[PDB]
Amino acid sequence: SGIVVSPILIPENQRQPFPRDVGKVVDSDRPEGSKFRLTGKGVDQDPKGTFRINENTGSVSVTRTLDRETIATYQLYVETTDASGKTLEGPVPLEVIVIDQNDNRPIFREGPYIGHVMEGSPTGTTVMRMTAFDADDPATDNALLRYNIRQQTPDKPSPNMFYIDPEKGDIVTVVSPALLDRETLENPKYELIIEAQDMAGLDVGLTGTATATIVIDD
User: Fold this and answer.
1) What span, in angstroms and rounded, lies between the C-alpha atoms of 29 and 78?
2) Domains assigned to the chain
3) What segments bear the compositional bias annotation Basic and acidic residues (predicted)?
4) Which of 6, 44, 79, 106 lies in the 20 to 30 Å Cα band around 93?
5) 18 near 62, Cβ under 8 Å?
6) DSSP labels for 124-135?
């Protein structure tokens, strides 16, 4: 269960106050003593201190407003280290991408998305929920977002092991419990591409995607 990252998309021209959380790094089986270390352009190199990571929780924050015309992307790296400072999970690239303030495409902000399902789980078992934008914000309601699993890899033993609720973003199993079994699964980890599309509102038709993994567990 190594370090898991997602690209961090940050709208340009964020307002006060700062810092704000923009993403997160996962490493669930991190040993005790372990801490996260973030490095790169915008971190320990120029523009210094633009981004920080909570060394304990792996939450990534931005400390100032960004202008996409100034820097459009930042290549960050994250590792875990000992209490001393010795590297445990060698550095993993992590990109920050500054979004144009006129780019209103839906964004899944809560990744990396990592799901788990017990083998033999009943058909209709909820694995996880993935949704785009905030929700509870100035209404995300207006977008009428609808969700779809664009791709599942591997495409075996069924091409559609899961189904995302179009409205809610709840990912459920749709195969017999008998099919959910590590030993008979050629690959027990699935990579999904999930898409959100605005079905109404001023940004009707805009789409965004994220990846998720789902592991069938013992």
Assistant:
1) 16
2) 1-101 (2.60.40.60), 102-218 (2.60.40.60)
3) 21-35
4) 106
5) yes
6) T-EEEE---S-S
